[PDB]
Nucleic acid binder design. Structure first.
Ligand SMILES: Nc1ncnc2c1ncn2[C@@H]1O[C@H](COP(=O)(O)O)[C@@H](O)[C@H]1O
Ligand SMILES: [Mg+2]
Ligand SMILES: [Mg+2]
Ligand SMILES: [Mg+2]
Ligand SMILES: [Mg+2]
Ligand SMILES: [Mg+2]
Ligand SMILES: [Mg+2]
Ligand SMILES: [Mg+2]
Ligand SMILES: [Mg+2]
Ligand SMILES: [Mg+2]
Ligand SMILES: [Mg+2]
Ligand SMILES: [Mg+2]
Ligand SMILES: [Mg+2]
Ligand SMILES: [Mg+2]
Ligand SMILES: [Mg+2]
Ligand SMILES: [Mg+2]
Lengths: 52, 95, 107, 95, 325
RNA sequence: ACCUCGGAGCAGAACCCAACCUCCGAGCAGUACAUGCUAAGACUUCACCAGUCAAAGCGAACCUCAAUUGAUCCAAUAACUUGACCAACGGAACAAGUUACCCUAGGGAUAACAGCGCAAUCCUAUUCUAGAGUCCAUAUCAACAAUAGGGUUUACG
RNA sequence: CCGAGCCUGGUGAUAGCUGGUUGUCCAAGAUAGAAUCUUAGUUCAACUUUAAAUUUGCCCACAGAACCAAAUCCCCUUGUAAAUUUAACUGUUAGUCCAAAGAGGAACAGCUCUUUGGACACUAGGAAAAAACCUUGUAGAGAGAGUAAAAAAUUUAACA
RNA sequence: ACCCCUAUACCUUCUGCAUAAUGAAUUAACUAGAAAUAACUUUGCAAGGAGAGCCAAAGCUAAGACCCCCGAAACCAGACGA
């Protein structure tokens, strides 16, 4: 049902975080905080990392 | 733990302990929390935080560790800028 | 078959009249056997804790639920026209005063 | 606490044309409310015809009679069977 | 062991035989009100408060109201802001005095100034400190105004046909507490004018120490039946001006009753320094505000499951110490 | 048959408390993406390991849910991170039968015989008067039941 | 003495298993739980011993400890004297009956399983003999004294 | 001297043994706690100690004081035997 996915920030590169999403649906894009940049920034899904 | 070695006839260190722990000169034993680089997704942030801290070992545990190592690991070591240097000696104790 | 779960060790950790420092947990429970009162907080377990240095006291205080929390409101509505619910509350009554003005210098 | 004199202070469980017809029904309901009688339910039953109901329970003969009189004092009625006239209405009782 | 209740239990009378006959508070507001009422009531079970805590006139009024309604005719309502000044004036005339008591109680003037015992300030006192040409900064009861604005003595009115106007700081600065510092003392005044009445102690500005908090000065006004003597030159010595109003009231003000009050808040400012230096002739005291230190439990020999931060909590201080090498 | 986790009773009023005791369930979902950093002070499943709560501060706005999980070393990863119904669930990196052809160390801490306790079952005697006995409860049988006693049985311990 | 010979060597093989552990005298001294290829063992905890440092420790009295019995917790006074911490350890971690509240089983067991409290595994007197019921504990000598627990009771069917 | 009264050998193993649980005919001689880290103790010296190296935010050097015996079936190497 749910996939684990890694999400890569465009600005503040190097910072990746792991999240859930349903396997059936769209590649995920999300606003989230980069502590490197110290601002909210768009992350994009890249590579699933185990499924469950 | 080899109380007398075959050739030198000295005690040996269990090197597992050396790999895993840091003996402060005061004889506290510092350890990385277990389960700290594992299944971090399912873990709540607070739990993660908890798991990323170092911890001091129990008295009994400390004693065990002392027994498990030789007097070399208990010496005073004057490192240039070890981040733990300030914790070796102890300040303002009272029983 | 079935489960054999360990004892949960919940209940009061600090009783009325005990000196309780800010942060001390006062009572742990599932559901509200006690409620947070003056200077007493609630964790995600419903566990009650002291928000200031002081003395614990217990009191039976009239209970009004939050308007937004529906089930309680409904219950209240259901009650007859001279009824009041009542519930037990845990307070810390603070001891040491937050402030004391000291003389720095004569300028 | 059980043994304390403030035992069950928290205890709470023990305490706990069509348009015209509609208007008439509403009025009846209001009257019932005023006079302190249990209005259980009301229905929206199906040229055209339209029915409305006001289910009532528990009322003494004299009081009941009074109520009936007030209702009487347009369209129609139907509950002893007590019909009358000036779409449709049917105040079913349960005395 | 089942003990009976000491007094009557709550929820006893209302349960009754049947539940379906009663009215029930279908709303929340009613319930809330009930709760409030209950709270207000005392009870026997400790509880919160233990541990912490003409006809003609009426007719005339009615007539006026009717007239107003007629004038409106209502349409306006179907958005009229109303004149506020007039309302204020009315309040002053009538229930202003009543109101004033509450404020006084809140501010602890009756407990500190008069040692207990409340009284209504009937006669409305109207003071204002002049700031340039206009506007005159009015000393409404409770207001914050700076000691720069209070450098020179104010203008006073009250519309009353003898009086004794007084002004005192309630905190008791510098020296030990249960003391007060008077700022002036006007005496044996005929009518509305200050210049006509005598003055024993002349005006100082407020002189609140830096970071000492906020102080509460108080103007006092009494009714004179009999003219009386009082007691000291244009002085800036502090040991003379230290006096408490309670004792004064007791041992002297016997043919006298207070009728007018206004209290006034004060903070630090640049004039305070001047006051300290020029006329008082001393170094101004600086007041910080020190909180009590952080707690921490006793120093444990083997901390066990605390982080490496355990040792940073018990240390004097920060810099790296080198024992003997 | 079960072996890990949780809720209710036993366990009626601070915790704690067993059994191959009685009963429900879990090994997930949903909403977010500041489920950001850190940090006083506590609780803790009777050890340890694991868990829990958390004021202030700095950053920002203007979590729900009972259980819903798994160590170390190793792997896989530029790194962040991710790896088991390791379900015998504190996990040995990977292991099956059979032995009257058997052996050794032990054990009355655990059976078969025997004893012993108990007496469910069993055997007997009273009480009771339903009913059979052409009628008639007691010549003779005897239901429902009750009160005692025995230690033939098969069990149980 | 063939399910795989015999001898020597590795070999003082290895045993969570059994048996055995030798001068005197004194003192303190008993079985909450954990996990565990683990319940014949172990390692933590608990209890126990010693040497320290200390300030409180036990008894506790009003207040107080939800809703859906017995009692307990907390607890100032008070009677007392110790308890907490630090430094070293070993050993117990296969228990029994009695009273009480329960559970399984037969409302069986000298049956099985929890909890509270006794006792026993440590002398004595009693209850016939007796582990666990009752009286009783700090020691030695006396050809002195007062006590404690402490010895089962019954006997019975007329009737007009 | 018996006769009177009191008196359930010992060790081990046990929840519990006079037990009808083990062992022991008796004498003789032989026959079983051995190791340092870390503690404590008393000396020595002491911001140093130690007969190099090692340790040292009162240490260091010194001694003293703790840690059994008997027993398989077995496995393997090399000889010797029809
Ligand atoms: N899913 C897993 N997660 C973590 N470690 C694993 C996993 N599977 C195998 N291992 C490790 O891999 C090692 C080698 O086993 P494999 O089956 O070859 C084991 O010792 C385990 O520790
Ligand atoms: Mg614990
Ligand atoms: Mg915060
Ligand atoms: Mg055969
Ligand atoms: Mg064959
Ligand atoms: Mg054999
Ligand atoms: Mg047996
Ligand atoms: Mg036996
Ligand atoms: Mg018959
Ligand atoms: Mg051997
Ligand atoms: Mg002794
Ligand atoms: Mg038994
Ligand atoms: Mg048994
Ligand atoms: Mg034997
Ligand atoms: Mg082998
Ligand atoms: Mg031949």
């Amino acid at each position: 049902k749910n996939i684990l996915v890694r999400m890569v920030s465009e600005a503040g590169t190097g910072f990746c975080f792991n999240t859930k999403r349903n396997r059936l649906r769209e590649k995920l894009t999300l606003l989230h905080y980069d502590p490197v940049v110290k601002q909210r920034v768009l992350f994009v899904e890249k590579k699933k990392i185990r499924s469950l | 733990l080899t109380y007398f070695s075959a050739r030198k006839g000295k005690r040996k260190t269990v090197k597992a302990v050396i790999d895993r722990f840091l003996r402060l000169h005061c004889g506290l034993w510092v350890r990385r929390k277990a389960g700290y680089k594992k299944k971090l997704w399912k873990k709540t942030p607070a739990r993660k935080k908890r798991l990323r801290e170092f911890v001091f070992c129990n008295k009994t545990q400390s004693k065990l560790l002392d027994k498990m190592t030789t007097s070399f690991w208990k010496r005073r070591n004057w490192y240039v800028d070890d981040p733990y240097q300030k914790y070796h000696d102890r300040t303002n104790l009272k029983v | 078959l079935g489960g054999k779960s360990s004892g949960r060790r919940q209940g009061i950790k600090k009783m009325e009249g005990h000196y309780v420092h800010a942060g001390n947990i006062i009572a742990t429970q599932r559901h509200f056997r006690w409620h947070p009162g003056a200077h007493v907080g609630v964790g995600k377990n419903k566990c009650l804790y002291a928000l200031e240095e002081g003395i614990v006291r217990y009191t039976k205080e009239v209970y009004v639920p939050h308007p937004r929390n529906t089930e309680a409101v409904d219950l209240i509505t259901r009650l007859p026209k001279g009824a009041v619910l009542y519930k037990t509350f845990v307070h810390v009554v603070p001891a040491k005063p937050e402030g004391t003005f000291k003389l720095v210098a004569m300028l | 606490y059980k043994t304390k004199p403030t035992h069950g202070i928290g205890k709470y469980k023990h305490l706990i044309d069509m348009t015209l017809a509609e208007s008439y029904a509403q009025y009846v309901h209001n009257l019932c409310n005023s006079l302190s009688i249990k209005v259980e339910e009301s229905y929206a039953m199906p040229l055209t015809t339209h029915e409305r109901v006001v289910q009532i329970s528990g009322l003494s003969a004299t009081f009941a009679e009074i109520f009936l009189e007030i209702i009487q004092s347009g369209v129609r009625l139907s509950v002893x069977x007590x019909x009358x006239x000036x779409x449709x209405x049917x105040x079913x009782x349960x005395x | 062991r089942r003990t009976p209740p000491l007094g009557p239990m709550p929820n006893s009378d209302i349960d009754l035989s049947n539940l379906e006959r009663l009215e029930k508070y279908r709303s929340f507001d009613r319930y809330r009100r009930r709760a409030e009422q209950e709270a207000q009531a005392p009870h026997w079970w400790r509880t919160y408060r233990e541990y912490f805590g003409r006809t003609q006139q009426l007719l005339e009024r009615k007539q006026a109201i009717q007239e107003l309604r007629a004038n409106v005719e209502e349409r306006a309502a179907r958005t009229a802001s109303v004149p506020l000044d007039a309302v204020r004036a009315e309040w002053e005339r009538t229930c202003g005095p009543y109101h004033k008591q509450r404020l006084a109680e809140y501010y602890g003037l009756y407990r500190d100034l008069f040692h207990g015992a409340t009284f209504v300030p009937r006669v409305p006192l109207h003071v204002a400190y002049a700031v340039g040409e206009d506007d005159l900064m009015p000393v409404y009861c409770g207001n914050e105004v700076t000691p720069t604005e209070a450098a020179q003595a104010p203008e006073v009115t009250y519309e009353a046909e003898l009086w004794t106007l007084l002004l005192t700081s309630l905190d008791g600065h510098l020296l030990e507490p249960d003391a007060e510092y008077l700022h002036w003392l006007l005496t044996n005044i005929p009518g509305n004018r200050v210049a006509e009445g005598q003055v024993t102690c002349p005006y100082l500005p407020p002189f609140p120490a830096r970071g000492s908090g906020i102080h509460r000065l108080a103007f006092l006004l009494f009714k004179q039946d009999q003219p009386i003597d009082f007691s000291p030159s244009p002085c800036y010595q502090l040991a003379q001006r230290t006096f408490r109003t309670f004792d004064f009231y007791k041992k002297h003000q016997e043919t006298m009753t207070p009728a007018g009050l206004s209290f006034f808040q004060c903070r630090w400012d640049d004039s305070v320094t001047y006051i300290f230096h020029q006329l008082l002739d001393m170094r101004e005291p600086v007041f910080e505000f020190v909180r009590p230190p952080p707690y921490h439990p006793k120093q444990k020999r083997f901390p066990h499951r605390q982080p490496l931060r355990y040792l940073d909590r018990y240390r004097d201080s920060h810099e790296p110490t080198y024992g003997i090498y």
